[PDB]
Design a protein around this ligand. Structure first.
Ligand SMILES: CCCCCCCCCCCCCCCCCC(=O)OC[C@H](CO[C@@H]1O[C@H](CO[C@H]2O[C@H](CO)[C@H](O)[C@H](O)[C@H]2O)[C@H](O)[C@H](O)[C@H]1O)OC(=O)CCCCCCCCCCCCCCCCC
Ligand code: CLA
Ligand code: CLA
Ligand code: CLA
Ligand code: CLA
Ligand code: CLA
Ligand code: CLA
Ligand SMILES: CCCCCCCCCCCCCCCCCC(=O)OC[C@H](CO[C@@H]1O[C@H](CO)[C@H](O)[C@H](O)[C@H]1O)OC(=O)CCCCCCCCCCCCCCCCC
Ligand SMILES: CC1=C(/C=C/C(C)=C/C=C/C(C)=C/C=C/C=C(C)/C=C/C=C(C)/C=C/C2=C(C)CCCC2(C)C)C(C)(C)CCC1
Ligand SMILES: CC1=C(/C=C/C(C)=C/C=C/C(C)=C/C=C/C=C(C)/C=C/C=C(C)/C=C/C2=C(C)CCCC2(C)C)C(C)(C)CCC1
Ligand SMILES: CCCCCCCCCCCCO[C@@H]1O[C@H](CO)[C@@H](O[C@H]2O[C@H](CO)[C@@H](O)[C@H](O)[C@H]2O)[C@H](O)[C@H]1O
Ligand SMILES: [Ca+2]
Ligand SMILES: [Ca+2]
Lengths: 115, 95, 32, 243, 37, 169, 60, 450, 176, 30
């Protein structure tokens, strides 16, 4: 399965993924609940600004039989992130709440795939 | 008549590092100072005497040993606003 | 290095190709 | 109000130079304990009127302030300022500016064509009330002093490349008359200004405060070339008190 | 870099883009061959 | 020539003030850059007295010494230069003092190197100046050669050099 | 992989042959009846060589 | 057709004017030339692929064609990193081979085909004075141009997406799903001022607006194509314009000059259609990057970056725009309209936000700002990077600089060509392009001016 | 090397400020203008003396008549510009006169620069700027530019002088 | 008062331009 060494080599990507996940739980949910769409867009552009690279590097450096599922799931978080961006630009509370929940569910499904 | 920084250059400011007026670039000559310990010196300025650079809150033991090692390179003159206003101690327009 | 030898040879072939077309058309009296 | 507006909504419209307004006309108050510090979050300061005390040839004539027109544009507001309001034992409230965009250079034009630049600022303003306050309300007047640094820094070079810590100390274009000008010696003394912040609007639900200010401060001396003029600035202010 | 099975023709590709310039030259040659009539 | 004459008087046994006092004021006046005809301007009109002024007296010869007692000479202004930096070198051509433009990283300011100046002969004979304002002013005077006191109010002299009748011819 | 290099070298050699031949044949009104099927066959051979280069690229 | 001066009246140095009334040889000229354009496209792409180091940024490497392909979403991933080299190679090979086909066809029509197409077919044969046929050709070519714009739309919406530098999570290839069909936004871009802060159409800052514009262009060009097939020029157009081949050439020359100027400004200012991951930073981008880099560096040393006045009295790092927005200080005050994906997270409603500058700056923003300030589009003609006073060790001129300079110059010379061909078309239609007739000289019949 | 000499005369002599040079610039740019405008005017008022669109073969060197219309050219420039040449001989003498006079005037200025007799300064603006540090013109800015170029260029340009200028004495603005 | 002299020489040049255009010697074919 996963050589402990291989696991140690994946940390490079896991630390920013855990940081982005914890921040998405804490700051982003409150900012969406606050109807603060300017700070919502600047959150999903700045502190999440390397989510795509870090998750695709996590999926590339993963076990070779779990790569597709990984990347697939990662791409779904991004799609929810773009739809969240569009709903925040439209000042839509319910649509942005829904896209945040879908992004959270796909992030957690991505986080269940770690060795 | 001299301006004020020329008259400061007549003093011990013109010979060694002044904890109340020297820019951060002058701390590069002491090993281990730039950027962190020099920033803590500049932030906690002014000082009445050299010795109370050891009484900055939040100094680690290695920082205290480094400050004790380079105590003779320091002077204290009166803080002149011509070198301190507008954070010229951090960026005096010199690159 | 042999890379620049080939570059010059390919370039010399391409350079002679156009004047070759002109020269065969002029030598045989084609529709110049 | 520019609270729900985005950058694209405000850009190039002049609304970035105006302070936020307490929409709620609520004449509420903010309760304060007798030995506690309350933080001020986004203190804003919008100058509206500008006056310069004229200097006559006469000595004993009344001085009087004359209105000036701003030549710089909508670049005359202080904003994003953090501060502290501490309540002493005797209910004396003390406003204390900490940091932010707490200065703007402003050039005003007087009748006669004299252009008066000045360093409009609230830098290190400490301002006390009368004692005996249990809240912040419409009677809170923070009157105090602030520092006015020199308009030109010590790194400024004049048109003949003379300055304080850089530049020549003499008039190099006139080699036999180089040291006969007092403008060769530049200086940047620290001036003082007086500021009164009178609160007129308190929204106790969110801790917002608004009101008016009157300020008096010296003008630009151009590195000590000329004597400073007295500038009076009146305007409006807003802040958010952290309960 | 080119894909590996094409890498034998890296020098030829390196002289490929300046061939249009020769075309501008070539017309002059042809006019020289006809006498610039 | 002035140095040859002073050195001859020093070799005879005179003191520095005694040797420098035997230099004629006319000879020291020739050793001044404002009498060089390559310092004028096309539209700086009239007499050279309309420039620096009417010369009144030779101030004497400055000797600049650093805190360590190295004699320093101010590098003289060449004919090409409208302005010139103030540089002071020792006997073996090492810059020991200057007047810095940027005083953030200065290492050889008159104030930092403790430069004093003593005058021999002339109006300031036997005097020693230690204030860096006066020392820098005498350094700028030494840039122009021998120093002279000038009356500027008679012809309302503007302070820029004129060329002589030699240059105009 | 050497047969793909042989195919591409054949393509560039026949391309040079066509660069020499096509404007000469088009500017020869007195040899046109000989040279027109030669031009047809050259176009077909060049197209077949390009298709073969593509197929052997996906075979290598 | 005459191939000499005695039989045409045109010298060798004006030889291609011998084709004006020879439609078959004109078509072969046009088609061989297209060969040349597609040849340069393919051969330059293969050159750029052969010289490409894919782990190195494209803009470091003198590439102007691979950025165009990468912006379409081929061979790249997040942050514009090169996944595969094969799409760029494919685009090159297909152009190169097709260019061979186009070159063979131009040679045919030019050397062997019929010199005039009018005696052969009425559909293809044209007279320049036949206003119906000229507008028919406009119409066919407009339907094709609209189809090309719709092909860009199809690539962005249905076949893999385009690179969006503004994408959340970082810039990435994304599929456009909600294009801006709102004609108020699409045509208000046309109504915006060509000045600072407005930027006309150069300021299009999102891929949804770009793809929606190409839906409208495709629709507009297809509708205008049918219009011009089915219709003939009206009386005001017939009385206003010159109807000749040189006249239509000069109209196209003025059009090309306008688009060359627009392209140079587009690549100089716009970072959306020309993403900075491929083209490098714009000049405004790099200046704001330097101001941000030293804001971050001095803030790390403990400077109060908001309360710091500079030597002039303005804020050293932060100051106010003329409308009041909180912007970076120094000379980059000029560039306060700049928007970029690395910078916009630190912007609030009023401009640059103090709270975000204090505790929201990420290391990747610092890395991007340092890279962009050191890849400013400043360089020498022999490709020595940086300011011109720097020494020879940095081999870099930005692709934005090369593309902008090229197209400005091209645009200027095509305006010159417009003036030359319009003036000559007017004189030739009026009958005095060959000089003043001595007998009927018009000035000799005019009254004196004074 | 010629470029160095050019920049040298800028920073050491303020040779742009010299009216003798300014007359030379007027003469050279005017001669280039006269060349361009005369060639274009002749080529666009040509008489139709041939059948080709190639108008160059409608001229014979032994012909007695003018190949272009002086009258039409004069009317064109009189209505476009306000004035025009009416005399061909004066036109060609002026075409001689302008750049030759420009060269002679700039030579007079160079003879002035040989003795450092420069148009370096406007003494009134220097005295005003020395007494008033708000007064700035483009002339004073150019004076500062010359000062900087002299100090930074002299040690490498005059290596025989052994100018040792330490880094602290070099004039420079903020941050550069 | 040097501004008066500058205004005078510039005005003289512009007036010469007016008189040289509006009251030129008229070109006549003879
Ligand atoms: C017949 C026509 C007659 C028409 C006359 C009308 C005048 C036309 C000329 C306009 C004058 C331009 C002056 C200022 C130009 C300018 O501010 O900039 C140019 C503007 C672009 O504007 C810029 O557009 C930018 C848009 O970018 C913004 O949005 C981008 C989105 O990615 C980025 O995010 C970027 O960071 C962000 O700032 C910003 O708004 C800038 O502030 C803004 O200045 O170009 C444009 O609008 C359009 C292109 C301008 C003209 C193109 C060159 C023409 C030259 C002809 C020379 C001929 C010579 C022949 C001689 C014989
Ligand atoms: C070779 C001739 C010569 C020389 C070398 C001198 C030299 C001198 N004279 Mg004497 N002078 C002369 C002739 C000469 N003079 C003549 C002929 C007269 C009678 C008018 C005088 C009257 C005179 C007076 C009244 C005074 C002098 C003074 C002086 C001194 C200052 C000179 C000065 O300021 O000039 C300044 C020179 C210039 C600013 C140059 C002006 C040249 C103009 C600008 C050139 C014009 C160019 C032209 C228009 C372009 C043509 C256009 C194109 C189409 C061809 C100097 C020692 C002064 C002095 O100090 O007295 C003791 C003084 O007061 N002189
Ligand atoms: C884009 C460039 C371009 C193109 C497409 C053309 C095209 C044309 N020109 Mg123009 N021309 C050009 C540039 C161009 N010209 C320039 C730059 C000049 C100035 C020197 C001229 C000067 C000029 C004159 C003076 C004349 C023409 C004429 C012609 C036409 C007939 C040519 C002819 O009889 O050639 C015959 C020439 C040959 C048979 C020599 C061989 C030419 C072939 C094409 C070589 C192709 C080589 C290529 C590598 C082979 C690839 C083959 C395959 C693999 C694709 C033709 C349509 C003539 C015209 O108006 O006709 C009425 C004419 O009189 N041209
Ligand atoms: C839009 C046109 C365009 C642009 C922007 C570029 C830009 C670039 N190319 Mg490319 N290239 C082009 C066309 C273009 N090229 C064409 C047509 C060819 C075929 C000849 C090439 C062949 C080519 C090669 C083979 C290489 C490049 C390289 C480069 C890079 C460095 C360029 C350099 O050092 O130039 C140096 C600058 C010059 C030579 C200046 C030329 C000045 C011209 C002649 C002025 C013309 C003015 C005007 C039009 C003339 C009209 C006269 C009349 C009207 C009076 C740069 C990214 C290099 C690179 O790094 O690639 C990886 C490289 O190796 N290019
Ligand atoms: C703009 C380009 C263009 C135009 C207008 C013409 C026009 C013409 N050609 Mg030419 N031709 C061209 C390009 C062009 N050709 C090219 C590139 C080649 C090389 C392959 C040829 C080779 C060629 C030959 C060998 C002959 C002609 C002939 C003719 C004439 C009869 C056409 C015919 O039978 O159509 C009717 C045919 C069709 C409707 C079927 C073809 C439909 C096309 C080819 C399919 C789709 C086009 C394309 C693949 C789409 C993508 C193109 C891409 C650039 C976007 C006509 C004047 C003939 C001639 O001279 O008559 C005397 C003739 O013998 N052509
Ligand atoms: C590139 C393709 C193309 C070309 C060559 C033409 C060519 C022509 N069109 Mg067609 N047209 C096109 C595309 C094209 N059209 C499209 C896509 C559509 C659909 C929207 C139409 C719809 C259309 C109609 C409805 C009509 C024409 C007409 C005409 C004819 C006269 C046009 C004229 O005088 O304009 C000159 C322009 C003017 C006189 C208008 C002056 C307004 C000022 C000058 C605009 C200045 C804008 C400035 C320069 C640039 C700013 C850019 C932007 C911000 C606006 C001419 C044959 C006319 C005709 O005869 O019908 C058969 C006509 O009535 N066209
Ligand atoms: C697509 C655009 C286009 C088209 C189709 C034409 C078509 C035509 N032009 Mg026009 N022209 C154009 C653009 C265009 N022009 C532009 C942009 C300009 C401004 C510069 C001109 C200026 C112009 C003039 C001044 C004249 C024409 C003429 C002509 C006719 C004869 C051209 C000929 O035989 O050239 C022959 C080609 C040459 C002699 C070679 C040109 C050499 C150039 C300078 C090379 C430039 C360098 C290039 C960038 C690459 C650098 C290579 C370097 C490394 C060596 C023909 C109808 C003539 C005319 O009026 O006929 C009626 C004429 O006198 N053209
Ligand atoms: C009848 C006609 C005669 C009158 C003509 C009117 C002329 C007007 C303009 C004259 C030009 C001179 C103006 C100089 C400005 C001025 O005020 O000077 C004023 C100067 C006097 O200058 C004054 O001098 C005084 C001492 O006496 C004081 O020093 C004053 O401060 C000083 O200003 O007048 C002259 O010097 C005139 C002498 C000129 C000699 C120049 C010799 C160099 C020759 C150059 C030849 C150049 C040729 C170029 C060819 C092309
Ligand atoms: C008419 C005329 C003219 C013109 C001509 C022209 C313009 C042309 C053209 C032409 C063309 C336009 C062409 C072409 C071509 C192409 C080719 C021939 C190709 C190809 C291919 C190949 C072979 C490729 C290969 C490869 C691959 C596949 C991949 C890898 C790499 C390589 C490269 C190897 C002139 C001016 C002379 C004048 C006279 C007349
Ligand atoms: C795609 C896109 C888009 C869109 C765009 C659009 C929608 C457009 C358009 C366009 C248009 C819509 C245009 C136009 C134009 C026009 C012109 C350019 C014109 C003109 C003119 C002329 C040419 C005229 C002339 C004349 C006159 C003046 C009078 C007399 C007669 C004559 C004819 C001479 C956007 C931006 C959104 C985004 C990006 C992408
Ligand atoms: C038909 C118009 C053509 C242009 C002609 C106009 C100019 C002619 C002269 C009249 C000008 C009088 O106008 C007046 O000038 C003075 C002198 O600069 C200006 O005064 C200005 O400069 C002086 C000194 O330089 C300052 O002390 C004053 O504070 C300042 O405003 C006045 O602000 C202006 O109102
Ligand atoms: Ca190679
Ligand atoms: Ca220092």
């Amino acid at each position: 399965t996963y050589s402990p060494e291989k696991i140690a080599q994946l940390q490079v990507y896991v630390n920013p993924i855990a940081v982005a996940r914890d921040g998405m739980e804490k700051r982003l949910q409150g900012l969406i609940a606050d109807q603060n769409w300017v700070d919502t867009q600047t959150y999903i552009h700045g502190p999440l600004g390397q989510l795509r690279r870090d998750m695709l590097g996590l999926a590339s450096s993963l076990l070779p039989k779990d790569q597709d599922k990984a990347k697939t799931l990662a791409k779904e978080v991004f799609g929810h992130l773009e739809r969240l961006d569009a709903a925040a630009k439209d000042r839509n509370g319910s649509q942005a709440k829904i896209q945040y929940q879908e992004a959270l569910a796909d992030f957690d499904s991505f986080l269940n795939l770690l060795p | 008549e001299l301006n004020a920084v020329d008259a400061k250059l007549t003093t011990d400011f013109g010979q060694k590092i002044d904890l109340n007026n020297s820019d951060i670039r002058d701390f590069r000559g002491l090993r281990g100072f730039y950027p962190n310990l020099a920033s803590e010196i500049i932030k906690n300025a002014p000082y009445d005497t050299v010795e109370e650079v050891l009484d900055i809150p939040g100094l680690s033991e290695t920082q205290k040993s480094r400050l004790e090692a380079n105590l003779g390179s320091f002077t204290v003159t009166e803080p002149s606003i011509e070198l301190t206003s507008g954070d010229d101690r951090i960026n005096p327009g010199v690159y | 290095n042999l890379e620049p030898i080939f570059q010059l040879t390919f370039l010399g072939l391409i350079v002679l190709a156009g004047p070759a077309v002109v020269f065969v058309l002029a030598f045989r009296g084609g529709d110049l | 109000d520019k609270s729900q507006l985005t950058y694209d909504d405000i850009v190039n419209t002049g609304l970035a130079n105006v302070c936020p307004e307490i929409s709620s006309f609520t004449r509420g108050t903010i309760e304060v304990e007798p030995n506690t510090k309350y933080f001020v979050s986004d203190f804003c300061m919008e100058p509206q009127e500008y006056f310069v005390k004229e200097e006559p040839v006469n000595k004993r004539q009344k001085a009087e302030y004359v209105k000036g027109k701003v030549l710089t544009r909508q670049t005359t507001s202080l904003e994003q300022i953090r501060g502290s309001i501490a309540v002493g034992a005797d209910g004396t409230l003390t406003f204390k500016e900490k940091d932010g965009i707490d200065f703007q250079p402003i050039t005003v034009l007087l009748p006669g064509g004299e252009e008066v630049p000045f360093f409009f600022t609230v830098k290190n303003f400490t301002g006390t009330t009368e004692p005996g306050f249990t809240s912040i309300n419409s009677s809170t007047d923070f009157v105090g002093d602030f520092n006015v640094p020199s308009y030109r820094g010590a790194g400024f070079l004049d048109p003949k490349a003379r300055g304080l810590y850089t530049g020549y100390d003499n008039a190099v274009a006139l080699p036999s008359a180089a040291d006969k000008f007092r403008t060769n010696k530049k200086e940047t003394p620290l001036g003082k200004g007086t500021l009164s912040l009178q609160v007129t609007q308190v929204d106790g639900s969110t801790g917002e405060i608004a009101g008016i200010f009157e300020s008096e401060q010296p003008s630009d001396t151009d590195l000590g070339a000329k004597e400073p003029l007295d500038v009076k600035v009146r305007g409006i202010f807003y802040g958010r008190v952290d309960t | 870099k080119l894909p590996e099975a094409y890498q034998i023709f890296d020098p030829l590709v390196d002289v490929l883009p300046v061939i249009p310039l020769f075309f501008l030259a070539l017309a002059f040659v042809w006019q020289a061959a006809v006498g610039f009539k | 020539e002035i140095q040859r004459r002073v050195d001859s008087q020093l070799a005879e046994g005179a003191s520095l003030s005694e040797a420098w006092s035997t230099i004629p004021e006319k000879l020291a006046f020739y050793d001044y850059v404002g009498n060089s005809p390559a310092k004028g301007g096309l539209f700086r009109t009239g007499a050279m007295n309309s420039g620096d002024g009417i010369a009144q007296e030779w101030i004497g010869h400055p000797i600049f010494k650093d805190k360590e007692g190295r004699e320093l000479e101010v590098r003289r202004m060449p004919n090409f230069f409208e302005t010139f930096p103030v540089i002071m070198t020792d006997a073996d051509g090492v810059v020991r003092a200057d007047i810095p433009f940027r005083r953030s990283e200065s290492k050889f300011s008159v104030e930092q190197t403790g430069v004093t100046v003593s005058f021999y002969g002339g109006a300031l004979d036997g005097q020693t100046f230690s204030n860096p304002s006066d020392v820098k002013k005498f350094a700028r005077k030494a840039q122009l050669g021998e120093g002279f006191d000038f009356d500027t109010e008679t012809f309302n002299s503007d302070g820029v050099f004129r060329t002589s009748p030699r240059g105009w011819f | 992989s050497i047969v793909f290099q042989i195919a591409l070298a054949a393509l560039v050699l026949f391309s040079f042959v066509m660069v020499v031949g096509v404007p000469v044949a088009y500017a020869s009104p007195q040899n046109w009846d000989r040279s027109k099927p030669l031009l047809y066959l050259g176009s077909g051979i060049w197209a077949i060589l390009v298709i073969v280069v593509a197929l052997l690229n996906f075979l290598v | 057709g005459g191939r000499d001066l005695p039989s045409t009246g045109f010298a060798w140095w004006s030889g291609n004017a011998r084709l004006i009334n020879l439609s078959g040889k004109l078509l072969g000229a046009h088609v061989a030339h297209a060969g040349l354009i597609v040849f340069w496209a393919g051969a330059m792409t293969l050159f750029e692929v052969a010289h490409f180091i894919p782990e190195k940024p494209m803009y470091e490497q003198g590439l102007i064609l691979l950025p165009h392909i990468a912006t379409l979403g081929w061979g790249v991933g997040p942050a514009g990193e090169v996944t595969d080299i094969f799409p760029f190679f494919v685009v090159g090979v297909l152009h190169l081979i097709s260019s061979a086909v186009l070159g063979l066809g131009g040679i045919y029509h030019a050397l062997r085909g019929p010199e005039v197409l009018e005696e052969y077919s009425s559909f293809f044969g044209y007279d320049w004075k036949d206003k119906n046929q000229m507008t028919n050709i406009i119409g066919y070519h407009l339907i094709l141009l609209g189809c090309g714009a719709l092909l860009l739309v199809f690539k962005a919406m249905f076949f893999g997406g385009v690179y969006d530098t503004w994408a959340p999570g970082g810039g990435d290839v994304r599929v456009i799903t909600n294009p801006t069909l709102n004609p108020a936004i699409i045509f208000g871009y046309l109504l915006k001022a060509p000045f600072g802060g407005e930027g006309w159409i150069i300021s299009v800052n999102n891929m949804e607006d770009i793809i929606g514009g190409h839906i409208w262009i495709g629709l507009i060009c297809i509708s205008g194509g049918i219009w011009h097939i089915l219709t003939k020029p009206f009386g005001w157009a017939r009385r206003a314009l010159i109807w000749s081949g040189e006249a239509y050439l000069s109209y196209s020359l003025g059009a090309l000059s306008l688009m060359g100027f627009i392209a140079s400004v587009f690549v100089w200012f716009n970072n959306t259609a020309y993403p900075s991951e491929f083209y490098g930073p714009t000049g405004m981008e790099a200046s704001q990057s330097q101001a941000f880099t030293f804001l971050v560096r001095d803030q790390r040393l403990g400077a109060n970056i908001a309360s710091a006045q500079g030597p002039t009295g303005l804020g050293k790092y932060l100051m106010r725009s003329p409308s009041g927005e909180i912007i970076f200080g120094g000379e980059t005050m000029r560039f306060w309209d700049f928007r970029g994906p690395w910078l916009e997270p630190l912007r609030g409603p009023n401009g640059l936000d103090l709270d975000k500058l204090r505790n929201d700056i990420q290391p990747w923003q610092v890395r991007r700002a340092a890279e962009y300030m050191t890849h400013a589009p400043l360089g020498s003609l022999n490709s020595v990077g940086g300011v011109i006073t720097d020494v020879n060790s940095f081999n870099y001129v930005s692709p934005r600089a090369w593309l902008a300079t090229s197209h400005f110059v091209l645009g200027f010379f095509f305006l010159v060509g417009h003036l030359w061909h319009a003036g000559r078309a007017r004189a030739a239609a009026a009958g005095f392009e060959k000089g003043i007739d001595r007998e009927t000289e018009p000035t000799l019949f005019m009254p004196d001016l004074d | 090397g010629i470029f160095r000499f050019i920049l040298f005369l800028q920073g050491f002599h303020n040779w742009t400020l010299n009216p003798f040079h300014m007359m030379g610039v007027a003469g050279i740019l005017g001669g280039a203008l006269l060349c361009a405008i005369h060639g274009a005017t002749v080529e666009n008022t040509l008489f139709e003396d041939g059948e080709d669109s190639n108008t160059f073969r409608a001229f014979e060197p032994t012909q007695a008549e003018e190949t272009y219309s002086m009258v039409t050219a004069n009317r064109f420039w009189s209505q476009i510009f306000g004035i025009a040449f009416s005399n061909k001989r004066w036109l060609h003498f002026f075409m001689l006169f302008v750049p030759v006079t420009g060269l002679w005037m700039s030579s007079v200025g160079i003879v002035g620069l040989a003795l450092n007799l420069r148009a370096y300064d406007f003494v009134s603006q220097e005295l005003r700027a020395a007494e008033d540090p708000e007064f700035e013109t483009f002339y004073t800015a150019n004076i500062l530019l010359n000062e900087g170029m002299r100090a930074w260029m002299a040690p490498q340009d005059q290596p025989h002088e052994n100018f040792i200028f330490p880094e602290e004495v070099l004039p420079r603005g903020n941050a550069l | 008062m040097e501004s008066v002299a500058y205004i005078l020489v510039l005005t003289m040049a512009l007036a010469v331009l007016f008189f040289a255009i509006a009251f030129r010697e008229p070109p006549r074919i003879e």
